Amino acid sequence: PAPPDQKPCHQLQPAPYRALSESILFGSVDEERWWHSTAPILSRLLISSNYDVDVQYKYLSLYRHLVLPALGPYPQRDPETGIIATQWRSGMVLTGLPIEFSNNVARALIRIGVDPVTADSGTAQDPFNTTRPKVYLETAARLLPGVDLTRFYEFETELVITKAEEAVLQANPDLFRSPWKSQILTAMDLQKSGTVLVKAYFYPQPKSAVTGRSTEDLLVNAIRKVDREGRFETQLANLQRYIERRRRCSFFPHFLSTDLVEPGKSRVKFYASERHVNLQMVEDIWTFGGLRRDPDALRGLELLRHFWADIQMREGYYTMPRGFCELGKSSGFEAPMMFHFHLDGSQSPFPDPQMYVCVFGMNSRKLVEGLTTFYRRVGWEEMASHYQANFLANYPDEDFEKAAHLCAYVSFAYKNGGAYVTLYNHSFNP
Amino acid sequence: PAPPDQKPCHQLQPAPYRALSESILFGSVDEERWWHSTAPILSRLLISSNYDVDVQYKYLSLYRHLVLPALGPYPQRDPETGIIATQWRSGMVLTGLPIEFSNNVARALIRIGVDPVTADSGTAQDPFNTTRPKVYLETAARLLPGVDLTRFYEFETELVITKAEEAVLQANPDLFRSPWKSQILTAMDLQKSGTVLVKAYFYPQPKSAVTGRSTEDLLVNAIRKVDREGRFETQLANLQRYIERRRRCSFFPHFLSTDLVEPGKSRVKFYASERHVNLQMVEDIWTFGGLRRDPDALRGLELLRHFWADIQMREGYYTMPRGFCELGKSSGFEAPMMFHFHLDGSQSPFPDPQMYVCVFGMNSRKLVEGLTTFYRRVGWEEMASHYQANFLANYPDEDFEKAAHLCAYVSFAYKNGGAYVTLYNHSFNP
């Protein structure tokens, strides 16, 4: 596993962002303000991760053309409270913003997470944001080669509410009281070659409310129905058997995601949240109750233990987040830990697990110091030396003694004898 | 005078053009087809002229955002004749296309000439294209720093028809029978630093038709009225005295152009067409009847003589162009020679002349061979070696035994002890 690139880039206006900024005519004030609040962070991420210049420009232009209009209204500041939020509170970030850039610091790859929204999203005209995500994926599909939507349609049919089911949730608003209303989210994985890999995420909590089927049964029946070839059947069965063991409760099946490629090559990730945030519970999940203890499983768990200590995670029993914690809102915010399970079409009996720890509310500078300690432990030299100062460079006017919102989640997997660490960070500067 | 850069670039899809092409969503089919027919030529021009990568992207993006929508309907092919034209026939090129990229091969600088048009331009809704150029310059002005429109307004008021005068030309179409209907044209000079210098050109032949004032009196009264400080007064007077000498006819005042900067720093170029295309007439104009024979004037004229022979220009008496010669139309096309006079605000008694020879209808490959001979004569080594193959690389599928439309005009001046040569070339690939 070749160590990740990390070049320094602290510049407040990186050259590609300026070059485009001085050339773009925006047909919307919102698109213009979004750009100036996020494009500098994207541009820095791209040059620090050592993407080629041509590819930097491809992606900043794509950001401009495809993403900006899908971000909807620019966030607004409350005069007296100072809190800055958008009317639709996205399930993608705890700040509720519809945009997030994530940094795979094991490979130096950037991903753009987008909750496609309109001015009507959240309001009476569209209270569950049904159509705009689809339109976004459809547009991405015609623009971007290799983007195959067959998996999205199959899951949309099973996992997203129909127009009648909406009416039931409008007529009777007591049946779905959660403010987390996002059904679909998107992600574009930006490869070094210029190719974009698109993923869709499905959150069927509203379909659950209207049909009386639990989130688990929806996810599993969905996956099981779409899986014609039965490539996921073994891993899925054993994940179910594990969720069964756990129910006989703190483990909660939450959502899934799928890639958008040829069906017989497609791969799904099943997400579950866990509220006992402690290292004995991580082992239980990581090893499926001690059933999955091959060398690779245990070697990864030893390293997971090192990671957990290095970033200084606190143990605890943490309940699902009450509302949101938007910019201006104060965080020491505590939330649940999370796992995805990778249904990969291999012959492995168990799908590969990936841990997501919510670090939102932990001092972000401190957290990144702990990560640096971890980068050194695994010999990621360039990243050890340069990442922290690139991290802080994205939040120029911010106070890092108080700031605990800059990193929201960190994920850990073990792939090819190596740690895989991804930071999900604050992607917005007013 | 430091010799011009010229790097080779023969690639059919240069990297910046691909990078943008794979990222742009076009809200118009016309903008999309325009882009694919012209952006490769612009991208090649920019890398051969050795512009920085960031600046290449600034300008290709600007092309995309500001220019593409101003090009109006994509040109259409006639099934039986094969001729390819746009409904509005632009006065900017003999092909009638609203776009032209010109190459200053003395400095390696590119300029974008644009005739801003809509789907309505030329038709009953807008037969003289009055508003769209203004809108373009106004948009460029808010986008681009340093663009000052005070000069444009002053000349627009004097030189472009009012809405009543239009009505007179519609009601009575016999009063203006010329198909050259463009009143305003634009040019963006792309500097190496990233700064864009915008010029406006004014063609008052229609205002002439409705007011009964000759083109000359319009141009001179216009310049004279706008010139508060009297910076142009001496050069203008002597140019008039010369036009007077010539009338007492083949010399014809045609149009002017102005830069768009601070007024007291502004500079105008007065254009006139000459139909005795021969070297004795060039001397007469160049030296204002033998009144302007300082060493710089005569040293430039010696070099002009070399240029004229090297590109193998044919002498002759040539009358103004009857209609257009569009793509698919056959050229050995003969047209008038042309001169501009640079009213520069200096203390010189005479404004600097610049010759424009119409080479449209001369074999373009042959012409560029003759230019290469000229580049060598003046020691422009890189340009001598690489320009021809960069020229031909812009017209990939074309036959260069017949092709005489690829270069339309070539201009010659003498600035700072050195030749200044600019090619005005075909900027479109179907």
Ligand SMILES: [Cl-]
């Ligand atoms: Cl590079």
Ligand SMILES: [Cl-]
């Ligand atoms: Cl429906």
Ligand SMILES: [Cl-]
């Ligand atoms: Cl149902």
Ligand SMILES: [Cl-]
């Ligand atoms: Cl803390």
Ligand SMILES: [Cl-]
């Ligand atoms: Cl460069």
Ligand SMILES: [Cl-]
């Ligand atoms: Cl008017």
Ligand SMILES: [Cl-]
């Ligand atoms: Cl008048």
Ligand SMILES: [Cl-]
């Ligand atoms: Cl010839």
